Amino acid sequence: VIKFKEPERCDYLYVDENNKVHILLPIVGGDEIGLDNTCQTAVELITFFYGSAHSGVTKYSAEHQLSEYKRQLEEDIKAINSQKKISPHAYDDLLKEKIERLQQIEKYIELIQVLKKQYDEQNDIRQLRTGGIPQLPSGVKEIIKSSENAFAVRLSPYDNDKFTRFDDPLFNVKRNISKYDTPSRQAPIPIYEGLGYRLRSTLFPEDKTPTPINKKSLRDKVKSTVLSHYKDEDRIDGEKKDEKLNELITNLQNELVKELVKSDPQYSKLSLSKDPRGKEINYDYLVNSLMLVDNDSEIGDWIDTILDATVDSTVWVAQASSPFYDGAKEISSDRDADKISIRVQYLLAEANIYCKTNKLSDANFGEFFDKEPHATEIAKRVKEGFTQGADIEPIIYDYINSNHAELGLKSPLTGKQQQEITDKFTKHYNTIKESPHFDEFFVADPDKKGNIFSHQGRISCHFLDFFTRQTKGKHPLGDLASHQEALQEGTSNRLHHKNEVVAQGYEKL
Amino acid sequence: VIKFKEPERCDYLYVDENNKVHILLPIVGGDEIGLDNTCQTAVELITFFYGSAHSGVTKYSAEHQLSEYKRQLEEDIKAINSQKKISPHAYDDLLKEKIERLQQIEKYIELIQVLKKQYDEQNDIRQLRTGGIPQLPSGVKEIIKSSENAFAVRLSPYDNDKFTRFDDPLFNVKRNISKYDTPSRQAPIPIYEGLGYRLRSTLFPEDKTPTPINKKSLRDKVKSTVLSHYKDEDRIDGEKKDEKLNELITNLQNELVKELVKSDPQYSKLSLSKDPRGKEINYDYLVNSLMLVDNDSEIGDWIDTILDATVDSTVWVAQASSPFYDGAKEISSDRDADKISIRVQYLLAEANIYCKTNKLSDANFGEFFDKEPHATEIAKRVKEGFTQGADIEPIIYDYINSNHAELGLKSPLTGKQQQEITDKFTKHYNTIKESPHFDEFFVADPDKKGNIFSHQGRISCHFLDFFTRQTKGKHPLGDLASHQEALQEGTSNRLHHKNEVVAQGYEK
Known part of the structure; x- marks a missing residue:
């Protein structure tokens, strides 16, 4: 029994039950909500294509990691050969499976090379390396735009950042002019209209009257x-x-x-x-x-x-705390009101996501909530909610339900559906609450059918999906032409981090 | 394939690997920290002995549930006996195991009956059903007094409740006169000495100066x-x-x-x-x-x-929050200072538990911290901690370590040990933070050897242990005389909620 060198785990690599190799192209880090936004959006793609450094540790490209993995496979195949003078046929299955993975890996390496060498004449990949604040490549944008299970949402923080990198948000609301679009780069130019402004100015008004938060057990x-x-x-x-x-x-x-x-x-x-x-x-x-x-x-x-x-x-025994109640006694500054504004917006965005991924509506909820009188009315009800220490989420749900048809829904949201939104909102907001910027988030649901997956703590698409779009159908996939469909035939878009098939080839002793 | 009626699960009942039946007498609800304290301390024992109604649902006594279980066993043995004229040996194991359990169950039932009928002239059990605010029965007290793995702690809230029900606390500190000892039952008579008072009056003093809490990301x-x-x-x-x-x-x-x-x-x-x-x-x-x-x-x-x-x-990405930092910006009332006082006390009580339970010391830490200058000095350092936004726990550990020998410890607490206390403190405090009263808690460590167990969300003692002590050992246990020892020979005091040998007969 020789000891094999083929790794159980490799970045970006997933081996399914049929010994098919899938490379998952990362969009952003995370599981259900992306941990990168705005200016850092491109970092996972930069790493995939070129490598990058993180806290003084180099993270290597897919091509580098897959070439290493190839060398290890080749060593295992040689080791089987030498051991087959001593047991002429004892390793036949394993040798075949190993060679098949090797052939597929070599093909993926070639596809990466050819994308960069021959199908990048516009520098849409090379700009990851050379641009100041890079963009998602067009094939990734098209994947995102047509996704049924993952959506971006775009919010309005007071001090908004211009470098949003998700161009097709499901939820979107009016924003200020970013300070980065003004000559002094010091403050945004405010608008005095829309959801964000109504929230901020209602929660903490120009006269500086604090809003009491009277939260009781x-x-x-x-x-x-x-x-x-x-x-x-x-x-x-x-x-x-x-x-x-x-x-x-x-x-x-x-x-x-x-x-x-x-x-x-x-x-x-x-x-x-x-x-x-x-x-x-x-x-x-x-x-x-x-x-x-x-x-x-x-x-x-x-x-x-x-x-x-x-x-x-x-x-x-308490319910877990809502994001709306963080222990403060009052809203006593513009910053505090901005923070609460963003939370309300985010809850609306999570309702919107829930409605889109469950096929209840295709509307941008932010368009309705930005209009008068809705912007003012929602802000007033939330403010009153805080002074009564009431639960904030059902205030939003009740307003949505009163206006369900205008928001593109046939029916109001059930108690059950409301609780589902609330749990997603709470978990996702808690994951991203220390973000430097709250301008946009990418939210994926890998328990639903679609083109976006979770793998190794990356929110990802199939590399072959990307490749065919980026190369505009000009290079057909040969033996890999049915891998994309094979991944969809799987039972979950949440994929295992290690590859059990590379360990369970060996079980025959 | 006949369909058996013996349940997989029964309240208070545990079957070990050798088909021994153990009845666990409950002390309070919970897993490691008791959820009942003060005046409701008795509720689990009330239910065990007499049944009770909880949020409009009737809960049955142990005797009731064990009798039901006995009837089910008897139906399963009949179902085998009639079938064994037609397949003489096909059910040998199951029948023998089921008979071993039935004989044990019956014995336990008779023990409960006799305890109540004949060995309760003190009305030490009956006062569960009768008394205004019942007490733990003396045999339970003795069990607790004798425990190596579970200990009560007693703290000092401003508005202290006199109906503490854990009489032998490991950690204990000076308390006010409870309002319930005063003519109108509305306010305590405060003392102006000791740990509680120094924490409260330092964190929010008589002059009403708020203490800033400057906790930053x-x-x-x-x-x-x-x-x-x-x-x-x-x-x-x-x-x-x-x-x-x-x-x-x-x-x-x-x-x-x-x-x-x-x-x-x-x-x-x-x-x-x-x-x-x-x-x-x-x-x-x-x-x-x-x-x-x-x-x-x-x-x-x-x-x-x-x-x-x-x-x-x-x-x-932030570390998980300490109980000391809950999002408030200042200590700006007596209530806030009381809330924070209690948390400091609970942390000291958890350090004490850890030290007792690991045989590092036997001291009541509250005795030391109640004395001057320690009461004042710990309050001042904690207050300064809040205004700097510093971590509060190591402030306590550093003071303990500077005084380790006086607290009965041979050596200072290692970084490792500190972290273990912190985790226990955090998890236990979060479980009890909505308690109406913070006067006392019972904390059990079922990963350690001792006479107290965790079972079905109840912190418990062996019924036979209790029975022998309540009876003064007159009525000897007969066939059950070595069951108590057998449970100790197990690998853990955390016991499985559904039963192994009664579940896995079905598969084979």
């Missing part, structure tokens, strides 16, 4: 809502003390289950009239048995005691 | 530090413009890498002098080729540009 909210219908002087006392306690219990229960059923319908059966042992919650029990309150206790103390006696601690 | 922190060496009027301009740029690039690179290498040493090779294609970052390139800044730009604009030209976006 579920428990503090319930208690607060209930106590708004009482006043400080109210007591549980006098001859009608039991009627007053019953009304309190009833009000507290109603508010609590109202808030819980939003998250889970099981809680519609929650009751506060009894402890878990079936003991009646009444005045004597709370005052004389448990000794937690008395006749002169404030209503808020009565509430605390009722809840500690009747509600399991599992009910206060 | 890595990018904002780098840029701020660099810019502190410059003045607003500074430009990259005039005859020495390239030297000034070089000095800016060198300062920015030194600060960036200084901050990154804390978290990953690979970044010691990071360079800002070239873009990823090898293009020189110089004035002509930034100003005339890319057209991003000019001679009139502020130094902060130069920084942003340099970073966007040279630094991959994966470098800005």
